[PDB]
């Protein structure tokens, strides 16, 4: 029974590593983007097996094999395991998320919103203490003790009927890039510390992400990636 798609696609795998928020911060802005902006990177990540760049959907995958240069570097990701696993033009399943710290004896919470929405900015001031509004909202916020462990299951949250593995259409009449999907994701995830911005610290914190597919289904078989004869 090992060949069953359900029995195959029911295990956790790492996705990406992200830093820990310490302020409201500005969300990344679409491309092309000019210099001088205050948008910060490496704090927000989108839930999607397909390639992405700088927390946004993408078509071509890249890597920084050349370290030297000038400018701002970017994040990238792609589910090597999922893509190599099998062939399916279409796919749908519930996405399960789990997070574990990568620093000694740390405590924090996590925040999420589904597709179509966007990060909530701005901050309040309580008794001379500034706190971003993202602490409270309509959507779940999770809390864990020191050490840390977070787990829950998100339901399907995209308008499209299924998730296209290799799509070839366009999304809009003008300037739309061919083949770039629209909402093939489960939303965005982010982490933050329940402390006022006034007590920000210089040392950076980093955290990994693991995901798991539940109740997977597929359609319209396809091809598999080529491997060299070198």
């Amino acid at each position: 029974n090992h060949t069953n798609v359900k029995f195959l696609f029911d295990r956790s795998r790492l996705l990406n590593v992200i830093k820990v928020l310490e302020k409201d911060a500005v969300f990344p802005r679409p491309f092309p983007t000019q210099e001088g902006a205050q948008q910060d990177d490496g704090y927000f990540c989108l839930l999607t097996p397909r390639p992405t760049v700088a927390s946004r959907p993408a078509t071509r995958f890249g890597l920084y094999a050349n370290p030297s240069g000038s400018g701002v570097l970017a994040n990238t990701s792609l589910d090597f395991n999922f893509y190599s696993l099998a062939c399916f033009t279409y796919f749908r399943s519930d996405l399960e998320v789990t997070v574990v710290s990568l620093e000694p004896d740390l405590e924090f919470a996590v925040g999420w919103f589904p597709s179509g929405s966007e990060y909530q900015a701005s901050s309040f001031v309580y008794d001379q203490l500034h706190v971003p509004f993202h602490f409270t909202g309509r959507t779940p916020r999770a809390f864990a003790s020191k050490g840390g462990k977070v787990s829950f299951v998100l339901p399907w949250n995209s308008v499209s009927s299924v998730l296209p593995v290799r799509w070839g259409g366009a999304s809009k009449l003008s300037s739309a890039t061919r083949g770039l999907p629209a909402h093939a994701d489960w939303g965005t995830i982010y982490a933050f510390v329940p402390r006022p911005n006034e007590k920000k610290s210089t040392a950076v914190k980093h955290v990994a992400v693991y995901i798991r597919y539940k109740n997977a289904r597929a359609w319209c078989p396809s091809m598999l990636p080529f491997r060299s004869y070198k």
Partner: protein, 232 residues
């Protein structure tokens, strides 16, 4: 009564393949029905059954999925290879790719051949399989002792061939870190039985193609994690 707390031996742990579920987050959701999509998939065997085309490095970086029958004659087989999924020849077939993501396999292997040449030409071909031994057989005489079959050029154009499943175990190693009895299973070869006919003014050098597919009893086991080398 009060919680008769029975502490668990190793709780407060994270495990990769824990089967049970977790707490729902945003329940009470509705989804658009997807019954309108045809071509549903159940198991990888559906793709594993469909045949595909192998290839070979060009005879003295371009692999070739076809072979042309030469005019020269020799007692050695014209094309042969070991039956080992790790070999490059299977390194792009669907069956090989799927098998590369498992510990072991089980079942027979199915092979198909096709001819592409002139009109008024005829010939004969011999198909054979040889279990492992000291070294690969070379002469058609030696091969003839092993299991073989006769494929006529003109009777049909694809004399399907299947290698029987033979091994001193219940499975076999999908990949061979070191040569072993359970890993390799000898070789398979094709021999030109007799000189083919060259009719008037027809082109020369006919073309032959080979296809591979998993047998009806083909089965994998013990999934593993992939090699991400293909990204490079």
């Amino acid at each position: 009564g009060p919680i008769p707390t029975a502490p668990r031996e190793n709780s407060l742990m994270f495990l990769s393949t824990l089967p049970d579920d977790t707490v729902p987050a945003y329940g009470n959701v509705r989804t658009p029905p997807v019954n309108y999509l045809p071509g549903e998939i159940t198991d990888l065997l559906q793709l594993a059954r469909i045949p595909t085309l192998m290839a070979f490095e060009r005879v003295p970086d371009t692999y070739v999925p076809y072979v042309a029958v030469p005019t020269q004659f020799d007692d050695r087989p014209l094309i042969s290879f070991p039956i080992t999924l790790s070999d490059p020849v299977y390194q792009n077939t669907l069956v090989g790719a799927i098998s590369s993501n498992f510990a072991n396999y089980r079942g027979c292997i199915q092979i198909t051949l096709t001819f592409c040449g002139p009109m008024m030409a005829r010939g004969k071909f011999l198909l054979s399989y040889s279990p492992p031994n000291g070294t690969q057989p070379q002469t058609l005489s030696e091969a003839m002792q092993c299991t073989y079959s006769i494929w006529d050029i003109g009777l049909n154009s694809s004399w399907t061939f299947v290698v029987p499943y033979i091994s001193p175990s219940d499975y076999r190693e999908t990949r061979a870190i070191t040569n072993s009895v359970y890993s390799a299973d000898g070789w398979f070869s094709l021999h030109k039985l007799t000189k083919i006919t060259l009719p008037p003014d027809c082109p020369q050098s006919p073309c032959i193609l080979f296809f591979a597919s998993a047998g009806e009893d083909y089965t994998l086991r013990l999934p593993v994690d992939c090699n991400p080398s293909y990204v490079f």
